[PDB]
Design a protein around this nucleic acid. Structure first.
Ligand SMILES: [Mg+2]
Length: 1310
RNA sequence: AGUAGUAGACA
């Protein structure tokens, strides 16, 4: 009933006071926060920092290791097999036993080789044996492992084993010999890595000859395949049962030997696989200084590497290193083609590929940090004004331990000085780009070559708490200095006029807040009805827990335990706990009323990102989520009506909106300006633009949340009262003070440290009880993004109003874009046309008339614009970053996107590289669909069709080897099915090879429908046995879909159906999953069919619906699987385990294949199946085949005219659950719940009448039948492309554009 | 010995 809360009275702020304050503030010279970019300045910065660096860190004489694996190749590489491994291992051990060991590592490999060569015939039989026929032996306990006890170890090998189970220096970058040595070493490595050892046709001319056929002969290519084999062996050894034993593998005809030492299993957290590599000395990933030993022979040298301990993250990174480098070099290839208008030469391509492969091999945190610095440094020295001195000072705040670090520093220094001298010379080549986009993209690809979360876990666990503790302490000092009331309620403007120090972060001006709210109300009042309806269109009377966001599997804080930590749970568990302990299902406002007295609590956990410092995100408790949901719903509803706020936009509508803003800015500058003159005359003026790509320093931490309260009390909503407004203000008051708990991991770490250094003592003092402290003002990051972004928009509008009042004679222009801590400001200013006469005189006349603030607009008035905008933003506790903010007349950066004028450049390599890590863990069909979907998303984001096709091939191959369905593997369909690999349905291991264009247009499930059409046509034409077999396979798939339940249906949708996979089974079975028996759950699902499409709105039925949710196969899998645990997928999927679902039991994929074959061979085509398949072929091809028909029928001819590049532009591709619920509703509670869910309960029947007819026409099926509509319903619930300028928004034109871009350098006419 | 680190770790 929206309980009445205390409101806040206005204070009557006057815009005249702020205008006169700005008049005074602009009469003095103001120091610009940025520095001009010149070659001499950057050179001086580098020189000073380089000379000062030697005092920061102790002298180091030995460069540290940078290569994770050391190996070498002299000949072409062949993939390893079992027999090949056996013969290679025998030959390699024969070679090794003839060498002389001197280091303990050489002694250890000698002992391992002796033990392996002294293994019997039976041991060699059990060794290499598949899991089907493996039998335990005295020496061999696992298929690929042997035992090597201490009775068979020398003194040196045992010494090495003891070594394994036992301030930071830096090199001299200032030294000119250290740089030379590092450059020589890295250059030698790179040079030896380059040593040579319809769309399909276009791919053949271009992507094969100049990209694939060039890099296929390189040493890097074959070394990458060898690294894949070695990492596959190490992954196989990392199993929970195999890891405690020794292992010996050989590659390249016995030239490379991998010795795997006993290791902690990689299924555990914080474990390392330990291994040694012994190889023949030659070209490749060789670092002689960091090699453990070199054993000489009769003109043969054998490099023995150190013992390397590698974690799961780096091992999985190394496993896909070849594909990573390949996609990176292909992206570089396309970008070079776009920039230079020509294909790169062979030497440059080989160099780029070797550089990418070296970067992917060296998965080290320090190189990642260096590249993270570089991706910000490059925009700094390429701008007009930037914080490049601070960025260069930050680049030197690190020790350079490895040779690669010194080499990269050398290259970075050279590139930055050359850039600031000015044409964009490349960082990893010797080409001169014409566009800054080519350069920034290339270095961003280099940055994305590093996997996320390479940081040290223990250090980062503290580094994520440090900032929150520090800024809470700062807030405490501010409260002590100025008083609690002044800090919380803000300072008045008359106080700022007396104390100019008041303008700083965590302090705000009440007058500024009110004036900004007035400026926003000037827009909000012209759409009062729209704003009010949007507010009322929220979940204000809907029950709280009947929302998907309220029962999700995302993290949640529980209650303070006996030890004092905050519990870890998920949202659904807390929802079920509250519902069990409650009597009804409360509303959002009711839930806030019940839990208002409890206090906001939070924890911080790692985000696991690839930045130099890992930011952490906060997990709060339930009442905190209620308060935040109230505030964020209110402010999202209000902010949807503001065009300068960009979080409220869609996922990719932001790019379109910022494009429109840029067109407005460029249209304003197209023209001229006129300044009236004393004697009714006019001084002409030229319009100019200046973009500020701005970041915000400590956007949430250095903030005061109370500033929102008054803002909320003054923002215009069309509601007829203040009840909801007062509730939002109350909720904001209830998040002002929060409990911040430290993680138990950091707590135990500090508890294990005995004595404490002073900084750790200062950090620990923030927590009085030792577990949680109190944070004021700071709204936790990602909790009030919409509110704070709208507040920043309001402050920008306040600056606009103040500046307009300041200079009514000046017709300046302003465009503002806010996305929280990201901002894009566009200042349109005026310059004298001819010389400066009649303008300097005019400004002097204005000064002589008392308008002293005109001193700021004498020259470069955009500087004064930014100064005043920054000051007014600081009035609202918003600091523009002095380092991360760039100022430029041409180039802008916003939302990870680069603009040059109005052009758009989105980095598509990020999602392309993430496709290689795409693993939903739900099945072969689902994972293939996800990978292809991400490749299609890359195509929409600017990837070329050829590069997208290459990534599609790589991702499909990766998924095929992941699930064992590729030819020669155990789950290959051809071994058990009487059909071909390409004629098999995809859910049954069918071939995933499919062109990118059809996936982009037709869809993801096109392959199964095409196979169904082929089988139907064959059977209806000549009645083959093979076509009847394929139809029987489709029938078998349809049976499996019927065996499942409607409420258990996730992932991609296939009408034919697919196998159901359960992959991860928890050992604890979760909480609240046993209060209702399985029989009860299935009977309830049988007798309550309305709830397979809607959520129950009553507590009694919603508790059952939620307890049933904890037993979904896709829920227990997703509630226990982590991002890298795809490691386990190499054992229980490829080698195969009890994963798939068949006949109400969990079996292997092999059992599913056998059952499919048996059902398909004994299959007869009936009339019902005939009609069903006919409808499927005649209804899904009425639109999808038209895409295939459009692509096949069209013809492309290559015009001899050379391709012309152009600026890119973003174009567009131009409730039902309640309906099924109403259809299936029988009981009174089901009807009530579907009426509540439905927005228009009265029209529902008519809607149902429209649903039956619409499906009967478009889908050719009647929803009156239960099974048909049950199959149809998942599909009934159903894009922005970066193209060239001439392409229109019609969906028939974007496919045409893709066909035109089928060739990278040639023009195509259709 | 590795990863990591001017927060003491894996161990
Ligand atoms: Mg920015």
């Amino acid at each position: 009933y929206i309980p009445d809360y205390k409101g806040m009275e206005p204070i009557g702020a006057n815009i005249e006071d702020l205008v006169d304050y700005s008049k005074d503030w602009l009469s003095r010279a103001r120091n610009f926060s940025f520095f001009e970019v010149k070659g001499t300045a950057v050179f001086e910065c580098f020189n000073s920092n380089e000379a000062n660096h030697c005092q920061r860190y102790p002298m180091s004489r030995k460069p540290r290791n940078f290569l994770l694996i050391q190996c070498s190749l002299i000949t072409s590489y062949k993939p390893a097999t079992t027999l090949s491994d056996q013969i290679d291992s025998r030959r390699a051990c024969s070679y090794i036993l003839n060498l002389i060991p001197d280091t303990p590592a050489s002694y250890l490999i000698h002992d391992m080789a002796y033990r392996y060569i002294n293994l019997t015939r039976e041991d060699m039989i059990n060794y290499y044996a598949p899991r089907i026929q493996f039998k335990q032996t005295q020496n061999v306990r696992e298929p690929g492992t042997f035992k090597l006890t201490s009775s068979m170890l020398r003194a040196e090998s045992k010494a090495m084993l003891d070594l394994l189970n036992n301030q930071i220096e830096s090199l001299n970058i200032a030294s000119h010999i250290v740089q030379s040595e590092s450059v020589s070493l890295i250059t030698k490595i790179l040079s030896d890595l380059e040593l040579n050892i319809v769309l399909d046709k276009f791919f053949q001319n271009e992507t094969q000859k100049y990209l694939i056929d060039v890099l296929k002969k390189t040493t890097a290519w074959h070394i990458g395949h060898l690294i894949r084999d070695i990492t596959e062996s190490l992954i196989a050894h990392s199993g929970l049962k195999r890891s405690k034993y020794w292992s010996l593998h050989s590659y390249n005809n016995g030239n490379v030997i991998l010795f795997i030492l006993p290791s902690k299993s990689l299924e555990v957290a914080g474990s390392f696989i330990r291994f040694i590599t012994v190889f023949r000395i030659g070209p490749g990933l060789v670092d002689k200084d960091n090699l453990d030993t070199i054993l000489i022979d009769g003109d043969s040298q054998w490099g023995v590497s150190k013992v390397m301990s590698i974690d799961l993250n780096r091992l999985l990174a190394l496993n896909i290193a070849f594909e990573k480098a390949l996609i990176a070099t292909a992206t570089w290839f396309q970008y070079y083609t776009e920039d230079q208008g020509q294909f790169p030469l062979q030497y440059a391509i080989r160099s780029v590929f070797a550089n990418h492969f070296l970067l992917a091999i060296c998965q080290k945190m320090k190189l990642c940090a260096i590249f993270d610095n570089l991706r910000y440094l490059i925009p700094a020295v390429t701008s007009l004004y930037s914080g490049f001195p601070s960025l260069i000072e930050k680049l030197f705040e690190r020790p350079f331990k490895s040779s690669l670090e010194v080499y990269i520093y050398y290259n970075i220094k050279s590139l930055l000085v050359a850039l600031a001298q000015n044409v964009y010379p490349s960082f990893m080549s010797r080409i001169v780009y014409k566009h800054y986009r080519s350069l920034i993209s290339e270095v961003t690809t280099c940055f994305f070559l590093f996997e996320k979360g390479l940081h040290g876990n223990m250090n980062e666990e503290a580094k994520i708490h440090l900032e929150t503790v520090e800024w809470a302490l700062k807030f405490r000092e501010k409260e002590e200095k100025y008083g609690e009331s002044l800090v919380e309620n803000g300072y008045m403007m008359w106080e700022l006029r007396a104390n100019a120090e008041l303008a700083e972060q965590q302090l705000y001006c009440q007058d500024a807040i009110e004036l900004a709210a007035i400026e926003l109300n000037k827009v909000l009042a012209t759409k009062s009805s729209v704003v009010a309806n949007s507010i009322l269109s929220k979940n204000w009377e809907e029950p709280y827990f009947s929302q998907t966001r309220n029962i999700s599997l995302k993290g949640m804080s529980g209650q303070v335990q006996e030890d004092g930590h905050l519990s870890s749970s998920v949202t659904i568990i807390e929802a079920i706990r509250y519902l069990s302990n409650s009597r009804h299902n409360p509303s959002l406002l009711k839930l806030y009323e019940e839990t208002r007295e409890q206090k906001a609590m939070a924890r911080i956990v790692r985000k696991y990102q690839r930045t130099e410092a890992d930011r952490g995100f906060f997990i709060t408790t339930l009442p905190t989520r209620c308060r935040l949901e109230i505030i964020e719903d209110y402010y999202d509803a209000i902010a949807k009506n503001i065009s300068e706020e960009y979080i409220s936009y869609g996922g990719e509508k932001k790019i379109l909106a910022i494009q429109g803003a840029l067109e407005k800015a460029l249209r304003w500058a197209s023209g001229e300006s006129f300044i009236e003159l004393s004697n009714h005359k006019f001084i002409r003026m030229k319009r100019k633009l200046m973009y500020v790509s701005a970041d915000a320093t400590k956007w949430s931490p250095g903030d005061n949340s109370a500033k929102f309260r008054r803002f909320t009390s003054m923002l215009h909503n069309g509601l007829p009262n203040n009840k909801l407004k007062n509730c939002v203000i109350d909720a904001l008051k209830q998040v002002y003070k929060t409990d911040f708990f430290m993680s138990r991991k950091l707590r135990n770490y500090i508890d294990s440290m005995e004595s404490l250094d002073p900084h750790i003592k200062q950090f620990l003092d923030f927590f009085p009880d030792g577990h949680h402290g109190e944070v004021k003002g700071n709204w936790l990051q990602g909790n009030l993004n919409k509110c704070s972004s709208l507040f920043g928009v309001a402050m920008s509008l306040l600056f606009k109003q103040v500046w307009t009042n300041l200079f009514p004679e000046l017709d300046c222009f302003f465009e503002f874009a806010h996305h929280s801590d990201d901002a894009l400001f566009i200042y349109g200013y005026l310059e004298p046309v001819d010389d400066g006469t009649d303008w300097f005189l005019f400004v002097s006349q204005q000064i002589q008339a008392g308008h002293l603030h005109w001193f700021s607009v004498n020259t470069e008035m955009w500087k004064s614009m930014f100064n005043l905008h920054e000051h007014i933003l600081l009035l609202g506790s918003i600091k523009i970053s002095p380092k991360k903010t760039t100022v430029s007349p041409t180039n802008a950066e916003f939302l990870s996107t680069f603009f040059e004028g109005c052009a758009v450049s989105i980095p598509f390599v990020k999602i392309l590289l993430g496709s290689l890590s795409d693993l939903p863990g739900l099945g072969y069909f689902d994972d293939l669909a996800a990978a292809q979907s991400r490749c299609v998303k890359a195509l929409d984001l600017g990837a070329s069709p050829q590069v997208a096709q290459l990534a599609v091939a790589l991702c499909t191959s990766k998924v095929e080897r992941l699930y064992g369905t590729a030819p020669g593997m155990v789950n290959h369909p051809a071994a058990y099915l009487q059909v071909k690999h390409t004629d098999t349905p995809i859910p049954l291991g069918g071939n995933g090879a499919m062109s990118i264009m059809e996936l982009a247009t037709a869809g993801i499930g096109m392959s199964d429908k095409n196979l169904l059409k082929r089988a139907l046509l064959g059977y209806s034409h000549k009645r083959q046995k093979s076509m009847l077999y394929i139809l029987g396979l489709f029938k078998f798939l349809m049976k499996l879909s019927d065996e499942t339940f409607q409420h258990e249906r996730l992932g991609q949708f296939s009408f034919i159906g697919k196998v159901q996979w359960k992959i991860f089974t928890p050992k604890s079975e979760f909480e609240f999953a046993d209060m209702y028996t399985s029989k009860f759950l299935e009977l309830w699902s049988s007798q309550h069919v309305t709830y397979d499409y809607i959520i129950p709105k009553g507590r009694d039925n919603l508790l059952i619906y939620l307890v049933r949710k904890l037993n979904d196969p896709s829920i227990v899998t997703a509630m226990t699987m982590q991002s890298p645990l795809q490691l386990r997928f190499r054992m229980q999927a490829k080698q195969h385990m009890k994963v798939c679902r068949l006949d109400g039991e969990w079996v292997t994929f092999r059992e599913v294949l056998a059952a499919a074959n048996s059902f398909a061979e004994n299959y007869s085509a009936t009339s019902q199946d005939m009609d069903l398949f006919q409808t499927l072929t005649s209804c899904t091809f009425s639109k999808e085949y038209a895409w295939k028909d459009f692509l096949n029928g069209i013809h492309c001819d290559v015009i001899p005219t050379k391709q012309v590049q152009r600026a890119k532009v973003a174009r567009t591709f131009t409730s039902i659950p309640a309906v099924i619920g109403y259809k299936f509703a029988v009981t009174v509670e089901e009807m009530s719940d579907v009426l509540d869910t439905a927005k228009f309960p009265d029209s529902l029947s008519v809607d149902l009448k429209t649903m039956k007819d619409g499906v009967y026409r478009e889908l050719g099926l009647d929803i009156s039948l239960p099974d048909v509509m049950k199959r149809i319903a998942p599909m009934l619930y159903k894009r922005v492309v970066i193209v060239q300028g001439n392409v229109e928004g019609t969906a028939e034109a974007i496919c045409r554009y893709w066909l035109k871009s089928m060739s990278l350098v040639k023009t195509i006419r259709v």
